[PDB]
Design an enzyme around this catalytic site. Structure first.
Site, PDB file in Angstrom:
ATOM      1  N   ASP A  85       3.939   8.907  -3.145  1.00 48.39           N
ATOM      2  CA  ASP A  85       3.953   8.584  -1.687  1.00 48.39           C
ATOM      3  C   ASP A  85       3.310   9.757  -0.889  1.00 48.39           C
ATOM      4  O   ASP A  85       3.555  10.880  -1.227  1.00 48.39           O
ATOM      5  CB  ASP A  85       5.401   8.420  -1.268  1.00 48.39           C
ATOM      6  CG  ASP A  85       5.606   8.386   0.346  1.00 48.39           C
ATOM      7  OD1 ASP A  85       5.091   7.529   1.008  1.00 48.39           O
ATOM      8  OD2 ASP A  85       6.297   9.245   0.902  1.00 48.39           O
TER       9      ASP A  85
ATOM     10  N   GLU B 190      -0.710   6.864  -2.759  1.00 48.39           N
ATOM     11  CA  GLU B 190      -0.966   6.498  -1.316  1.00 48.39           C
ATOM     12  C   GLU B 190      -1.447   7.758  -0.648  1.00 48.39           C
ATOM     13  O   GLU B 190      -0.771   8.783  -0.674  1.00 48.39           O
ATOM     14  CB  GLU B 190       0.275   6.011  -0.609  1.00 48.39           C
ATOM     15  CG  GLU B 190       0.022   5.813   0.861  1.00 48.39           C
ATOM     16  CD  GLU B 190       0.528   7.007   1.655  1.00 48.39           C
ATOM     17  OE1 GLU B 190       1.721   7.230   1.508  1.00 48.39           O
ATOM     18  OE2 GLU B 190      -0.239   7.642   2.353  1.00 48.39           O
TER      19      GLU B 190
HETATM   20 MG   LIG Z   1       3.822   7.508   5.002  1.00 51.06          MG
END
Ligand SMILES: [Mg+2]
Ligand SMILES: OC[C@H]1O[C@H](O[C@H]2[C@H](O)[C@@H](O)[C@@H](O[C@H]3[C@H](O)[C@@H](O)[C@@H](O[C@H]4[C@H](O)[C@@H](O)[C@@H](O)O[C@@H]4CO)O[C@@H]3CO)O[C@@H]2CO)[C@H](O)[C@@H](O)[C@@H]1O
Ligand SMILES: OC[C@H]1O[C@H](O[C@H]2[C@H](O)[C@@H](O)[C@@H](O[C@H]3[C@H](O)[C@@H](O)[C@@H](O[C@H]4[C@H](O)[C@@H](O)[C@@H](O)O[C@@H]4CO)O[C@@H]3CO)O[C@@H]2CO)[C@H](O)[C@@H](O)[C@@H]1O
Ligand SMILES: [Mg+2]
Ligand SMILES: [Mg+2]
Ligand SMILES: [Mg+2]
Length: 755
Positions: A430, A483
């Site tokens: 993340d 991401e």
């Molecule tokens: Mg974020």
């Protein structure tokens, strides 16, 4: 080796197999060394020594007996290897069970760790059941180079460590062996720092932990608690290119999928435990165990037809409300849901059902809690000392010092640990931008540039590339997903090409474009056709995963239905169209729990999902829609074999903005597997709408999102349509279609239909 020695092994007469089996130095050359690896592999016909960090593989030869193997290898150091073991028609890859003769840290273990290259450091640091001086017990060791003293406190000495003071080695690591205790032991390290300040620490390498909010570590006999059954899964993984397979991910937060009753015990695999109450404000509810999740989540997912489950972070974390993103026990799965072996069972049962497991992994920071890694030894040990690179002030957390060898080593070995001990099939990281930038969320004059005056966090970039290099070498076939939200280049490209080495990247621009698009009243979508088509302009720069994640259905963003304009019918229709488009657009797929049945409320991490909705027909129909969409996805090679090549996609037409219609082809290896996709993104149906197709013949309707069984109005083309020899969209043939309202069609040429 001699036949006498081999027979001593085969007939269990040898006094100590570690003298012969495993890796042994045979001689030192000027620039290299000669080693032998030996293995006794009953039932194996063939074996190989893999040196994954050198990218080599050498056959082993049977010596004196068909199941006794030797392999002679020359290389300067033989620290990192695996055995590939063939038994009949199956291959497994394992670490060598005779690799380490001693439970204690050796000189070599300490050297490699000081250099940051001990990929198996968790075999020695932490707590391990073993034998020293002929007595069974536990060996503990902890890195804390600036501490003045360290003791082991636990249940076994009533939390008084005076008679369990540790011994410091090489000015770096503290160790102790305690006899006659075993797995189940509860402990911490008591550390005195250079100021004489005394404090209590969970084990950074601990394998199990009390239930939050208690923080003592628990000793686990991690290699003797569970028996796996997933060899065939793991062989297929290792021999396959996941980029060329269907990957449809169901993203799940374990603590909030489904709750049970706290008025009963939490059952475990062959056992039970006290219930873990979800919160003091909802005290009638408890978490489900890994074992119960295996029995309930897995068949649910299997029936829905997803290929993978992605978990929000399951590493031990003290606060429910961080959703797992603030970890303090990196080496243990959270005890909210039971024991390590119950999680191992979950993964084994996923693999038995043909489902892979992806773990969100959190190497970017850690919170300040005093039981955890912060200020560990009375210095900034894990975190960098300068807060301009060592804290994420807006989050209140601390940032690992990626440049410091033993810190890098904690993290690199941690990733590998989840693949080794828990057999997982991938990781997702993340917020990768938070590691990559020295100026991340920092104002002018409160960060410093790198040595070349840039904003790149050099040490973190190096760490990321090292993680991904090692992961793919040790565990070929895995997914490594990022991401990254700043258009950093080559995120999902190999390190050898200046990439970060991930194999997939979430397409956050696609996600924004699509959700912004669908949130617009359909009449106005004509002004935003470019939301539909733009993502294909940069698509080939990465290998994209199309994710509609947990982050998008919280904090006042609504759940998927509530994002959509119009009445109840059109809301559902808009969900069906968006997701049929997502599943036909190039790239892999991820969607979050609750989206598959049209939960109306936002995801609430403190409750469970609104399963009572599935008593009602509209929700059941959406769930059937996804079940069938997933089945199609797996059945049609053009939806997955060529996601990342130009061949796999071509627009047919995207100029009709005025009706919000687009159409495109997907292709695979066989030309007969080609698909024609047609999207109508308003509620106006169209009759005799022409679309160009490249060949004559009958085009079967494989899928129509307006079917009545999915909650649509059941407009469509009656099962299929013959192409006309009527050129359109620059193609020699065309189909004269009915376009259902707010709906997507998938058509495929049946080159054997009877005219
Ligand atoms: Mg974020
Ligand atoms: O079959 C006769 C009609 O068929 C075609 O109508 C279409 C509409 O064009 C489509 O948009 C869609 O209609 C949806 C509609 O968009 C949606 O709002 C909803 O409308 C309902 C509403 O839920 C309900 O509360 C009440 O007002 O009834 C409305 C019923 O029309 O649901 C509709 C689908 O049920 O689907 C039908 C296609 O079947 C054609 O265009 C029409 O001319 C023709 O009359
Ligand atoms: O009145 C009923 C009519 O129905 C049919 O017309 C349809 C076409 O079959 C559809 O394909 C679509 O037409 C689009 C077209 O697909 C799209 O490319 C775009 O066309 C632009 C074109 O791209 C550009 O090169 C320039 O040529 O001008 C074109 C016209 O704008 O937009 C078209 C729609 O505007 O929708 C129509 C109906 O609107 C049938 O074939 C017709 O004979 C019939 O009249
Ligand atoms: Mg004391
Ligand atoms: Mg815009
Ligand atoms: Mg509930």
């Amino acid at each position: 080796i001699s036949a006498d020695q081999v027979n001593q092994i085969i007939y269990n007469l040898h006094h100590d197999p570690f003298e012969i089996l495993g890796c042994h130095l045979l001689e030192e050359g000027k620039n290299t060394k000669k080693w032998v690896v030996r293995a006794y592999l009953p039932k194996a016909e063939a074996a190989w020594v893999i040196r994954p960090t050198e990218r080599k593989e050498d056959p082993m030869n049977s010596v004196h007996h068909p199941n006794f193997f030797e392999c002679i290898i020359e290389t300067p150091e033989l620290n990192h290897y695996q055995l590939k073991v063939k038994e009949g028609e199956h291959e497994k890859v394992i670490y060598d069970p005779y690799a380490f003769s001693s439970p204690y840290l050796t000189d070599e273990d300490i050297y490699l760790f000081s250099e940051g290259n001990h990929h198996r450091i968790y075999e020695k640091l932490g707590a391990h059941v073993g034998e020293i001086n002929g007595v069974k017990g536990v060996y503990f060791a902890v890195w804390a180079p600036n501490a003045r003293n360290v003791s082991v406190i636990g249940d076994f000495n009533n939390w008084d460590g005076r008679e369990h003071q540790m011994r410091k080695r090489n000015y770096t690591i503290w160790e102790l062996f305690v006899p006659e205790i075993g797995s189940g032991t509860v402990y911490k390290y008591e550390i005195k720092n250079s100021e004489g300040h005394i404090y209590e620490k969970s084990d950074p390498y601990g394998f199990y932990r009390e239930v939050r909010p208690n923080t003592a570590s628990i000793v686990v006999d991690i290699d003797n608690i569970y028996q796996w059954h997933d060899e065939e899964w793991l062989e297929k993984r290792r021999n396959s290119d996941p980029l060329k397979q269907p990957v449809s991910v169901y993203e799940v937060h374990l603590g909030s999928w489904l709750h049970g009753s706290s008025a009963e015990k939490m059952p475990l695999l062959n056992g039970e435990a006290d219930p873990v109450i979800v919160s003091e404000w909802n005290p009638g509810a408890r978490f489900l165990s890994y074992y119960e999740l295996a029995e309930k989540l897995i068949p649910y997912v299997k029936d829905m037809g997803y290929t993978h489950i992605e978990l929000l972070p399951i590493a031990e974390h003290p606060f429910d409300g961080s959703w797992g993103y603030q970890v303090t026990g990196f080496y243990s799965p959270t005890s909210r849901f039971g024991r390590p072996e119950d999680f191992m069972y979950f993964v084994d049962k996923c693999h038995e059902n043909g489902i892979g497991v992806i773990l969100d992994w959190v190497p970017g920071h850690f919170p300040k809690d005093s039981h955890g890694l912060a200020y560990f030894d009375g210095t900034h040990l894990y975190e960098h000392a300068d807060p301009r690179i060592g804290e994420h002030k807006e989050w209140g957390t601390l940032v690992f010092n990626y440049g410091r060898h033993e810190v890098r080593n904690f993290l690199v070995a941690n990733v590998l640990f989840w693949f080794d001990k828990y057999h997982v099939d991938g990781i997702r990281v993340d917020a990768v931008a938070s590691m990559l930038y020295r100026n991340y969320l920092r104002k002018e004059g409160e960060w410093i540039a790198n040595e070349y005056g840039g904003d790149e966090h050099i040490e973190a970039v190096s760490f990321i590339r090292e993680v991904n290099t090692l992961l793919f070498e040790y565990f070929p076939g895995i997914l490594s997903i990022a991401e990254e939200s700043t258009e950093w280049e080559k995120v999902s490209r190999p390190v050898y090409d200046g990439g970060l080495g991930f194999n997939l990247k979430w397409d956050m621009g696609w996600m924004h474009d699509m959700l912004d698009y669908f949130n617009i009243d359909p009449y106005f979508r004509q002004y935003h056709q470019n939301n539909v088509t733009f993502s294909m302009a940069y698509y080939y720069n990465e290998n994209f995963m199309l994710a509609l994640s947990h982050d998008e259905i919280v904090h006042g963003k609504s759940n998927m239905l509530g994002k959509m304009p119009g009445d109840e019918w059109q809301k559902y229709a808009n969900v069906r169209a968006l997701f049929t488009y997502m599943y036909t657009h190039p790239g892999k797929k991820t969607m979050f729990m609750s989206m598959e049945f049209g939960q109306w409320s936002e995801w609430n991490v403190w409750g469970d999902l609104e399963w009572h909705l599935l008593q009602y027909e509209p929700h059941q129909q959406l769930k059937q829609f996804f079940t069938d969409l997933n089945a199609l996805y797996q059945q049609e090679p053009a939806l997955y074999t060529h996601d990342f090549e130009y061949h796999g996609f071509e627009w047919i037409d995207c100029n009709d903005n005025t009706h919000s219609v687009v159409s495109f082809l997907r292709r695979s290896d066989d030309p007969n597997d080609s698909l024609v996709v047609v999207c109508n993104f308003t509620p106006q149906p169209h009759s005799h709408y022409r679309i160009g197709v490249p060949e004559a013949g009958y085009y079967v309707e494989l899928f129509n999102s307006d079917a009545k069984q999915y909650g649509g109005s059941n407009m469509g083309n009656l099962g299929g349509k013959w192409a006309d020899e009527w050129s359109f969209h620059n193609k020699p043939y065309s189909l004269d279609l009915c376009l259902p309202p707010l709906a997507v069609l998938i058509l495929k040429l049946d080159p054997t239909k009877v005219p």
